[PDB]
Paper text:
The avian β1AR was modified to allow crystallization by the removal of flexible regions at the N terminus, C terminus, and in cytoplasmic loop 3, and the introduction of 8 point mutations (see Experimental Procedures), to give the construct β1AR44-m23. Six of the point mutations result in thermostabilization of β1AR (Serrano-Vega et al., 2008), which allows crystallization in short-chain detergents (Warne et al., 2008).
We have determined the crystal structures of a thermostabilized avian β1AR mutant bound to bucindolol and to carvedilol at 3.2 and 2.3 Å resolution, respectively. With the human β1AR, bucindolol has been found to act as a partial agonist of the G protein-signaling pathway as well as an agonist of the mitogen-activated protein kinase (MAPK) pathway through a G protein-independent mechanism (Galandrin et al., 2008). This suggests that bucindolol can induce a signaling conformation of β1AR that is distinct from both conventional (G protein) antagonist-bound and agonist-bound states (Galandrin et al., 2008).
Numbering used by the authors: 33 to 237, 282 to 358
The structure:
């Protein structure tokens, strides 16, 4: 049994270290590629940078802390770090779906109203948009957690709050529903609605302007596939606590984490990223 534990720890630790490396390496490349290639320095890629930072924070902070919990079965970092960790987790997935939502609107307005778009949409303004996305994401994610709005009345929950080794996100039903709707479900619907409109307006309307759009359609689709299972379960868990097994919930949350390693791979469809990747890996 002690050998089974010693194998499981060292085994998992490496899988986790591989995941961390794939996320951090992949996204640092994307930030560097854009940051040092003036062919890639478009307004749209400013939003891709923002998105890569969100995925970077997942790789440097969210998954590391999450790994120590999955390896060692308990939280080792004190109740304050548990809260700050959870806040960063919630923050990143919120900022990601909001930025993807901006990207869809960006592409739409650029397609349907190209004269008015290109005369209004500036670098200064894309930065303002990006900050506003992060400001809103911070507001919706950080505050309710620090205010303990998520916490429930149950004695078993109360037991977990006092124990600085418990870092389970046992949330009340109101928070579970509200935070899911505000952080995920609303921006997801807006994104899908706008993305379908773009897909329609693309056919009605030029190889390089397209294909890049398809790429953006992929990242949005993949994100949805990685996160929808988690948020669906999260809502089901409110109506009946026992239907979904613990492992399936934890697994789906890890699928969502995994999404942070996927974009840099998907960007390799764009040859200019591919060339910038090859140059940087000197
Ligand atoms: C914080 C938690 C539950 C990870 C976690 C932390 N401790 C746990 C113990 C057992 C299972 C999972 C966990 N997962 C957060 C997910 O990344 C998604 O988080 C969210 C993002 C926006 C709105 C609501 C949620 C939630 N819940
Ligand atoms: C955006 C999140 C907003 C969530 C809204 C918080 C609702 C208040 C919490 C609540 O109703 N209970 C927990 C007691 O605090 C009672 C169970």
């Amino acid at each position: 049994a002690e050998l089974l534990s010693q194998q499981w720890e060292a085994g998992m630790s490496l899988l986790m270290a591989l995941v961390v490396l794939l996320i951090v390496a992949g996204n640092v490349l994307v930030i560097a590629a854009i940051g040092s290639t003036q062919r890639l320095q478009t307004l749209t890629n400013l939003f891709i940078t923002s998105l890569a930072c969100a995925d970077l924070v997942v790789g440097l902070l969210v998954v590391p802390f999450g790994a120590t919990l999955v390896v060692r079965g308990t939280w080792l970092w004190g109740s304050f770090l548990c809260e700050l960790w959870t806040s960063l987790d919630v923050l990143c997935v919120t900022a990601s779906i909001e930025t993807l939502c901006v990207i869809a609107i960006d592409r739409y307005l650029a397609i349907t109203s190209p004269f008015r778009y290109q005369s209004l949409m500036t670098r200064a303004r894309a930065k303002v948009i990006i900050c506003t996305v992060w400001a809103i994401s911070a507001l919706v994610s950080f505050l309710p957690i620090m205010m303990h709005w998520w916490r429930d009345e149950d004695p078993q929950a109360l037991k977990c709050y006092q124990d600085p080794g418990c870092c389970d996100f046992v949330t009340n039903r109101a928070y579970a529903i509200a935070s899911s709707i505000i952080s995920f479900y609303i921006p997801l619907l807006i994104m899908i609605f706008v993305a379908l409109r773009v897909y329609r307006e693309a056919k009605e309307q030029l190889m390089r302007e397209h294909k890049a759009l398809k790429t953006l359609g992929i990242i949005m689709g993949v994100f949805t596939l990685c996160w929808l299972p988690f948020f669906l379960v999260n809502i089901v868990n409110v109506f009946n606590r026992d239907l979904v097994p613990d492992w399936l919930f934890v697994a789906f949350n890890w699928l969502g984490y995994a999404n942070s390693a996927m974009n840099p791979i998907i960007y390799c469809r764009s040859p200019d990223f591919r060339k910038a990747f090859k140059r940087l890996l000197a």
